[PDB]
């Protein structure tokens, strides 16, 4: 025993227990999702209202990288910020040498290699977040999700955090009803709906909804926060659908 006391140790069955424990921190976090649409991506997150004293709209979780990439994560929030800071350095360096903004698959691997680097030594611990991210590049829309192991894949839809199981089931039905595609605007509404359904597994406190999107037609391939009327419309669609 003791195989789980130190990062980067293989157990006798080939596992890295510290990374598996990092996944527990992720599973403890709030629900976040990503939905891929015809010409873009949509991100949404559950923000638990700990107390009335939190200023509404003022603890923004979804972060932008460069001008075309959005990131959201569940688990240890500061670990997420650390990862986005690194992503921003990687995007700037790519842009500097190659002129073009970093493609999403390229960006995915930059984060992947950095997260994987923290599973190689006992002098660091793994990241306690799973990150959902994506955007629009020269080849269209891409959506990714990245685990504490450094493992990542492309996704039609993605979910993580405490309400991930309900969200996953809900995303799979979306992909079925809408097999020829989903518009950026229905995807925004559906994201609100799915966070609301996922919030039953966290029914204790109530929450605040945050949504963002990058769409070729709707945002010119730039990352934008969904605010005001369009958000209120998404809140309504979600409300009407649970009842």
């Amino acid at each position: 025993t003791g195989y789980d006391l130190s990062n980067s140790v293989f157990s006798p069955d080939g596992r890295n227990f510290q990374v598996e424990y990092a996944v527990k921190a992720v599973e403890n976090g709030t629900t976040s999702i990503g939905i891929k649409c015809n010409d873009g991506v949509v991100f949404a997150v559950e923000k638990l209202i700990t107390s009335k004293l939190l200023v509404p709209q003022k603890n923004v979780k979804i972060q932008v990288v460069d001008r075309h990439i959005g990131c959201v994560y569940s688990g240890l929030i500061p670990d997420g910020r650390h990862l986005v800071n690194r992503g921003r350095e990687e995007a700037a360096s790519f842009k500097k040498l190659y002129k073009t903004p970093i493609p999403i698959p390229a960006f995915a691997d930059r984060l992947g290699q950095y997260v994987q680097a923290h599973t190689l030594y006992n002098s660091v611990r793994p990241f306690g977040v799973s990150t959902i991210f994506g955007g629009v590049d020269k080849n269209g829309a891409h959506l990714y999700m990245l685990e504490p192991s450094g493992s990542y894949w492309g996704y039609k839809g993605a979910a993580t955090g405490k309400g991930r199981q309900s969200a996953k089931a809900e995303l799979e039905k979306l992909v079925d009803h809408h097999p020829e595609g989903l518009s950026a605007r229905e995807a925004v509404k559906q994201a609100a709906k799915i966070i609301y359904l996922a919030h039953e597994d966290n029914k204790e406190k109530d929450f605040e909804l945050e949504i963002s999107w990058c769409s070729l037609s709707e945002t010119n391939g730039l990352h934008k926060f969904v605010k005001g009327d369009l958000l209120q419309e998404a809140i309504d669609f979600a409300q009407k659908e649970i009842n």
Binding site: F10, G14, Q116, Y152, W153, G154, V175
Partner: protein, 241 residues
């Protein structure tokens, strides 16, 4: 017993972290196979996309290391992508310094050396992956070289890796006992891809759709992967046999 946690010798002269790294290699439950033709080298790997939410085009364990070298990995994807990026850097640097394309066996040796270092220095863990490199080398012809967490590597007539490797290995052994040659006697890589798929089917005892495999092909001066459509064309031809 902290001799089991870092790469120092146990009382029987074993390196337990290296052995446990060999076990991480099978975690993905994928099997791969490589064979040489006259003019080409083919690698095939099983493809499994259990989650419907995945984009299946991004699920892959085959890598284009250079214009001439391909690599299939058996083991977790993070360690695989670590190995791939490094190999890409090594292959490009070699071309810059020495003025010619890095050979498949030379890259394999280089990657095996890095792996040996992880078995000797305490601060680095082994990567839990096995790397099968392929090309048509301008001097050696069709080439398969495979590397593991012990830092061991060697050239092969053909090889197989994964949980069901032995089934495939003995199937291939029995073929080369009959033919008495070092390769698949065929002009077109198409027929060599068909041989490779045929013998994986017969050895595993399973049928494959176009989405169940991924295929890599090395020819003179280029390595490339097949689309699902190219694979279907290949599956059709097998069915008429």
């Amino acid at each position: 017993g902290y001799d089991r946690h870092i790469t120092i010798f146990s009382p029987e002269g074993r390196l337990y972290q290296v052995e446990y790294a060999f076990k991480a290699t099978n975690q993905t439950n994928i099997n791969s196979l490589a064979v040489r033709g006259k003019d080409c080298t083919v690698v095939i790997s099983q493809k499994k996309v259990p989650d419907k939410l995945l984009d299946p085009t991004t699920v892959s364990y085959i890598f284009c290391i250079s214009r001439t070298i391909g690599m299939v990995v058996n083991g977790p994807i993070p360690d695989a992508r670590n190995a791939a990026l490094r190999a890409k850097a090594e292959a490009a640097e070699f071309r810059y310094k020495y003025g010619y394309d890095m050979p498949c066996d030379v890259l394999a040796k280089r990657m095996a050396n890095l792996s040996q270092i992880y078995t000797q220095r305490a601060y680095m863990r082994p990567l839990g992956v096995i790397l099968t490199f392929v090309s048509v080398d301008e001097e050696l012809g069709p080439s398969i070289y495979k590397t593991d967490p012990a830092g061991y590597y060697v050239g092969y007539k053909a090889t197989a890796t994964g949980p069901k490797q032995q089934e495939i290995t003995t199937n291939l052994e029995n073929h080369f006992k009959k033919s008495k040659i070092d390769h698949i006697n065929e002009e077109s890589w198409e027929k060599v891809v068909e041989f490779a798929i045929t013998h994986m089917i017969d050895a595993l005892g399973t049928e494959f759709s176009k989405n169940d495999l991924e295929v890599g092909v090395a020819t003179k001066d280029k390595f490339f992967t097949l689309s699902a459509e190219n694979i279907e064309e290949r599956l059709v031809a097998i069915a008429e046999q």
